[PDB]
Design a protein around this ligand. Structure first.
Ligand code: NA
Length: 229
């Protein structure tokens, strides 16, 4: 028997401002459905406190997508609209099974592609330094596919316990805080200026796995998104 995330109070604020995409972007459950007890192996309350996401398959996802609160439609904001857009979370990333290589756990996306992904990564060298089993940010600064179109940053090695995140966007600049420590400050987003279709996402988005059956698994102890100003 799986317990629904909405059976406790902790995640109601974000569920009231989200729809769930599972197992792909085009297949979704509404905010009302989430608040109404949506549950399954892909999305359930683990150990009485974690909103847990599970997904297998290349580029499949089980992921919340920001909505206007209280039965509203899809949100679309701009990095330069003068408001501060903030997402917060507390995440336990457990050991990922063999075949899972990268799992995107928070994003800023838009109708013109992902501005930001925060992802767990099994192994990668960044700026000449090898990192393993860690959390990375990937920020798009161009629309090409080569790595020159991104800024990639090691944020933190994966921890045994819950890890907090805060993403702040204000006046075309991005700050990321992990476990209370600033890990990116003032990253320029002015390439996305004018793109009025941005929104937060969070959950599990499985990137470039080496097995199609390997199930990514991510646990949220907290998640919220807000505007201030
Ligand atoms: Na676990």
């Amino acid at each position: 028997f799986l317990t629904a995330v909405s059976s406790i109070d902790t995640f109601l604020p974000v569920l009231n401002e989200a729809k769930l995409q599972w197992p792909t972007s085009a297949l979704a459950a509404s905010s009302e459905e989430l608040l109404g007890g949506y549950v399954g192996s892909q999305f359930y309350l683990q150990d009485g406190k974690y909103m847990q996401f599970q997904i297998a398959g290349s580029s499949n996802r089980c992921e919340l997508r920001q909505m206007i609160p209280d039965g509203g439609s899809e949100i679309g904001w701009a990095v330069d609209d003068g408001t501060t857009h903030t997402a917060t979370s507390s995440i336990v990333v457990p050991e990922q099974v063999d075949g899972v290589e990268e799992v995107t756990i928070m994003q800023i996306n838009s109708g013109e592609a992902p501005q930001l992904r925060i992802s767990w990564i099994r192994s990668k060298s960044l700026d000449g330094v090898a990192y393993e089993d860690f959390i990375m940010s990937t920020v798009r600064i161009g629309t090409g596919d080569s790595s020159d179109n991104f800024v990639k940053t090691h944020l933190a090695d994966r921890t045994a316990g819950a890890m907090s995140f805060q993403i702040d966007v204000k006046d075309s600049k991005l700050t990321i805080t992990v476990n209370g420590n600033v890990v990116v400050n003032g990253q320029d987003l002015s390439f996305w200026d004018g793109t009025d279709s941005c929104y937060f996402k969070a959950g599990a988005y499985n990137n470039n796995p080496t097995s199609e059956s390997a199930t990514a698994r991510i646990k949220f102890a907290a998640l919220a998104w807000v505007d201030h100003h």
